[PDB]
């Protein structure tokens, strides 16, 4: 049996940690919902 527990409000945080790059990738999506790289 799966169950849910509240973890917080959904709000934008001013001055949150800023990280991560922005890659532009060629991808395919199959019928099972799995993404894959097209190369």
């Amino acid at each position: 049996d799966m169950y849910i527990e509240r973890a917080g409000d959904i709000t934008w945080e001013k001055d949150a940690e800023v990280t991560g790059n922005s890659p532009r990738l060629d991808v395919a999506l199959d019928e099972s919902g799995d993404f894959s790289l097209v190369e």
Partner: protein
């Protein structure tokens, strides 16, 4: 059960201890998560039961108690925040400029942030606090890193 708007952890007691299998969003009385988190199974919220209402394996999304309510979209230019809810750890916002998944059916925003699999379903927000999609379905790139699509449903 608890029906207050917000981000929730999706837990299971079937495995060792209490394990977090994912995350979801409660908005307008509907619970929204990724299909791979629950596999369409019923959910418990205290003494209450949440039954699936809509789901789609290809989109990897599922809603409970009602139709999908989230319809905000990434504007294609601005930074966003992943409100990551990792297993056993506090909710924390991480700001990032999304990249792009280019497909034969159109372009989708993508976030290059790495978290344990049990973080799937954490919401991605715009500057107005609107949920523009869920984190947790994507790809592993050439350096072992993880890049998730910004997955959004359709409000009927």
């Amino acid at each position: 059960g608890e029906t207050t708007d917000g981000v929730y952890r999706v837990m299971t007691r079937r495995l060792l201890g209490s394990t977090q299998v994912g995350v979801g969003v409660m908005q307008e009385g509907v619970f929204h998560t990724m299909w791979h988190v629950t596999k369409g199974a019923a959910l418990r919220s205290g003494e209450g039961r949440l039954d699936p209402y809509w789901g789609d394996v290809k989109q990897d999304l599922v809603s409970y108690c009602g139709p999908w309510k989230l319809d905000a979209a990434w504007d294609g230019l601005s930074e966003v925040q992943l409100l990551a809810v990792p297993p056993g750890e506090r909710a924390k916002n991480i700001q990032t400029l999304p990249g792009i998944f280019k497909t034969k059916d159109g372009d989708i925003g993508a976030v290059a942030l790495d978290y344990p699999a049990g973080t799937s379903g954490s919401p991605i927000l715009d500057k107005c606090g609107r949920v523009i999609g869920l984190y947790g379905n994507g790809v592993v790139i050439k350096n072992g890193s993880y890049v998730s699509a910004i997955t959004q449903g359709k409000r009927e």
